[PDB]
Amino acid sequence: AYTLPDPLVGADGTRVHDRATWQHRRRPELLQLFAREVYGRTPLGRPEGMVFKVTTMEHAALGGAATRKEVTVRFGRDPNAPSMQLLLYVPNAVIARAERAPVFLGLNFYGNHTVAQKWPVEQILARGYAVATVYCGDLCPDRPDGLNASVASWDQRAPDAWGAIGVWAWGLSRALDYLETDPLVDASRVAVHGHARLGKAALWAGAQDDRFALVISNESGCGGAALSKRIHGETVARINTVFPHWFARNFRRYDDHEEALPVDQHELLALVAPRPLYVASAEDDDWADPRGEFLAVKAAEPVFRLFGQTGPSGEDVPRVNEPSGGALRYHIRPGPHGMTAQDWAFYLAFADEWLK
Ligand SMILES: O=C(O)[C@H]1O[C@@H](O)[C@H](O)[C@@H](O)[C@H]1O
Ligand SMILES: [Mg+2]
DSSP states (O other): OOOOOOTTBOTTSOBOOSHHHIIIIIHHHHHHHHIIIIIOBOOOSSOTTOEEEEEEEEEEHHHHTEEEEEEEEESSSSTTSOEEEEEEEEEHHHHTTTOOEEEEEEEESSOGGGOOOOOOHHHHHHTTOEEEEEEGGGTSOSSTTGGGGSGGGOOOOOTTBOOHHHHHHHHHHHHHHHHHHOTTEEEEEEEEEEETHHHHHHHHHHHHOTTOSEEEEESOOBTTTBOGGGOOSSOHHHHHHHOTTTSOGGGGGGTTOGGGOSOOHHHHHHTTTTSOEEEEEETTOTTTOHHHHHHHHHHHHHHHHHTTOOOOSSSSOOOTTOOEESSEEEEEESSSSSOOHHHHHHHHHHHHHHHO
C-alpha cells in the first residue's frame, strides 16, 4: 500500500500550523518514530572521556594547497579505548585570510586514504571548502555480525536497538564534536554528506543532529530518501534480508508490509528543515528509486515552506543536470549509481549559496 502520512498532522491529529509547534512537538514525534520503527534508538550522545589526538599535521599537503590533519577520536580516556580516525584537508588560502573554513564531512566506504572511491578533494579545496572523512568500518564493520565489533558492542539486541546506519550516523556527529575544537574549521558551517548506504547515515545524522548546517543525500535510496511506500527498486524486505545489521530489528515488521509504516522518508527529510537539504538521484539508478526520491522531497516541501523555504518547482522529476529548488534542492544526473564530479559540482554551488 501507499498513502503517505502527513508531516504536518501530529500523532493526536492536530494540524501543525506554526514553526514552534513543529520544532518542539512534531519533530520529537517523528524522531522517535524513526528511531523506534526504522533505524533504532541512538543510545549514546557525546561519551565522556572522548579524547582527540592530532597525530599528523602537514602544512603543505597537495603542493602547499592544503593543510592535512590526522586525528584519532578516542571514545574513552584509556589510551587503548575504541577509536576512529578522522582525516581533514583544509585549504591554505582560507587559513591565510584568517577565516575558519566551512567543511564537507562524509563517511567513506574503503578507508580514509582511498578518497577506489575518490571525491574531488582538490576541487572542493580549490573552491574554498575543507573536507573531513571517517572510514565507516571504524564505527561498524559492514557485515551482518558487524555490530559485535562496533562502537555499539562496547541473546540478541533489542528490537528498537540501532544498527549500522545509526552507528555510522553517530560517528558523523562525533566527527562534528572534533570539528568544533579545531580552529581551522567552522563547525557551524558543516555540510554532512553521504553516498548510498552512507547517505542513509548522512540523512539520519542530519535529522537527529541539528548542528549540521547542510545535509546532502547522494542516491541513498531505500531507507534513505526514497519513499518506502512506493515499492520500487529496492524494497524493505530486500534491504533487511541482504543487510540485516543496517536497520533496527523493528524495521523488519515492514517487510513486504510498507502499508503499515507509520512514517515514510519524506518525514526524515522534513526533519532537516529549516536547514538546507539536497537530495540527488542517478537516471539509471532504478534500485534507489529516483522518482521516489524526488517525490519524498516534494512531500517534505510543506515543512520547508512553513519556514518560508522552497523546494523543486514542478511536480515531477526535473530534466537531467538541471538542479531545482531553493534551500530544498534536487537534481538527477545521467548514468548509473555512484557519486561523480557532476554531482559534486552541483553540491558545491549549493554550498556556495548557503554556507558562503
Ligand atoms: O551502492 C551500494 O552498494 C548500496 O546502495 C544502497 O543505497 C543500497 O541500499 C544497497 O542495496 C546497495 O546497492
Ligand atoms: Mg524502493
